[PDB]
Amino acid sequence: LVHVASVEKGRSYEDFQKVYNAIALKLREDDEYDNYIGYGPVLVRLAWHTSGTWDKHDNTGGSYGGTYRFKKEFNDPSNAGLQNGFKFLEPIHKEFPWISSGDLFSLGGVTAVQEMQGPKIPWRCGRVDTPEDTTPDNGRLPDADKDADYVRTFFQRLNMNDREVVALMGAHALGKTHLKRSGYEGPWGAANNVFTNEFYLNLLNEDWKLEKNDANNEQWDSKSGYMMLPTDYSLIQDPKYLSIVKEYANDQDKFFKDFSKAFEKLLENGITFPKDAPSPFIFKTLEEQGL
Ligand code: HEM
Numbered sequence: 001l002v003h004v005a006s007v008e009k010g011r012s013y014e015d016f017q018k019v020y021n022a023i024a025l026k027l028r029e030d031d032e033y034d035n036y037i038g039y040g041p042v043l044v045r046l047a048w049h050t051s052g053t054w055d056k057h058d059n060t061g062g063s064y065g066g067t068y069r070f071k072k073e074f075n076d077p078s079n080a081g082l083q084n085g086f087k088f089l090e091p092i093h094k095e096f097p098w099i100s101s102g103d104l105f106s107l108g109g110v111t112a113v114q115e116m117q118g119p120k121i122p123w124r125c126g127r128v129d130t131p132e133d134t135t136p137d138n139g140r141l142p143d144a145d146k147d148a149d150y151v152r153t154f155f156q157r158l159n160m161n162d163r164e165v166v167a168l169m170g171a172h173a174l175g176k177t178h179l180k181r182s183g184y185e186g187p188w189g190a191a192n193n194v195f196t197n198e199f200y201l202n203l204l205n206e207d208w209k210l211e212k213n214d215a216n217n218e219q220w221d222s223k224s225g226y227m228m229l230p231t232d233y234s235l236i237q238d239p240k241y242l243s244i245v246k247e248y249a250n251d252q253d254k255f256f257k258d259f260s261k262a263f264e265k266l267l268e269n270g271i272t273f274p275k276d277a278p279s280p281f282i283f284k285t286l287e288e289q290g291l
Contacts, residue, residue: 003064005126005273008098013281016107016125019096020283021291023111026088028286034175039088040112040193041175046085047109047267048171049078050102053136054269056159061140062270065130066101072132078141081181102127106267113263114285116174118195119256121263122280124273144184144229145217148238151231158269160262166235166244167258168266173199177227183215186227200249202226203236 008015023043031038050068053061067073074083089108093099099107103125110121142154155165175192177184189198206222213219220228235241248255264280 001059003059003062003128003130003271005064005124005271005277006128007126007278008100008103011098011125012278015096016099016103016123016281017283019092019099019104019107020111021286021289022092022095023089023108024115024286025291026092027112027115030088033084033088037175037193039085040116042082042085043088043108043112044171044174046082046089047106047112048168049082049141050105051266051269052142052158053140055136055140055157056269057157059270060134061136063102063106063267064127064271065134066103066105066127067130067132067135068105069101069129070132070135072138073135076138076141078138081178100127101129109263109267110283113171113195114283116193116195119260120282121260121267122282123264124268124271124277124280126273126277127271142231144182144231146231146234148234148241151234151241152238158266160266162240163244163258164262164265166241166248167255167262169232169235170197170199170248170255170259171263172229172232173197177219177229179213179215183213183217184219184227184229185213185215186219186221186225188228188232189226190224197248197252197255199232200245200255203228203232203245204249208233 027039033039051063055061089104093104107123110123113121172188173196176187179185189202191198206224206226208220208222210218211221220233235245
């Protein structure tokens with residue numbers, strides 16, 4: 001199936017900047033969530049999980065149809081906790097009912113990254129809601145207890161290469177694992193609601209110990225109180241991933257640029273943009289607007 005981007009009728013960059021801004025203002029206001037981490041990280045994860053169901057082989061799943069709004073997908077065990085991001089976005093959608101669900105979930109992620117001081121992420125509109133029966137089955141999102149070979153093979157289905165995978169994984173600077181959600185517990189670093197290359201630095205520089213958490217799963221833990229999932233740790237066990245981890249640990253701008261590209265790409269798999277579609281939008285942050 002072909003999913004052609006269709007601009008919400010009559011809308012242009014200013015309309016979407018208003019949605020951006022409402023997201024960004026609520027991110028600022030609703031600051032208590034998750035022990036004052038705020039909603040940034042879970043909105044980034046929502047954007048990723050609503051995009052990451054895509055299968056390049058048949059164009060099922062992906063961000064286009066906004067199918068997370070249907071119970072099969074919102075109740076995917078892999079999506080445990082993302083209901084908080086959805087609830088955050090609900091008043092946004094009520095204010096701007098014209099935006100499609102896919103456009104709102106993906107824009108939430110863009111807005112969160114940028115408001116957290118991350119790179120600009122160009123964003124295109126035009127996702128169109130598709131019906132309940134287009135919701136992908138559970139099981140398309142990745143397991144965390146696996147090795148580098150798993151990770152690499154997993155991401156081929158999303159048409160991501162080694163650099164794109166390692167870049168995307170840098171989003172694990174953000175937020176934390178929550179035992180009751182995923183069976184893993186702990187943050188990956190100190191700056192977990194500011195977008196930086198800390199994930200790579202911690203991978204390389206902390207003294208990691210392989211421990212079992214209170215859900216009886218193995219994770220890597222440091223004396224600083226940080227953790228890595230087995231799939232995170234795989235990025236320094238595999239020599240190809242390791243090189244790239246070192247690159248991003250040593251060049252914040254490179255990480256930003258590569259993350260931006262990969263994240264836009266992730267959010268756009270599956271979508272065909274007509275030749276005369278608008279160019280991607282680059283939203284101004286609240287700070288850049290003086291808001
Ligand atoms: C091999 C791939 C990946 C695996 C196995 C994985 C797994 C996990 C797990 C287990 C959690 C913790 C969930 C919880 O307990 O709340 C998590 C959190 C998170 N992941 Fe991933 N992840 C992967 C890739 C990504 C990618 C590609 C991104 C986005 C670019 C991403 C962004 C996030 C964010 C932002 C959080 C924190 C959520 C929060 O604090 O609520 N992850 N991930």
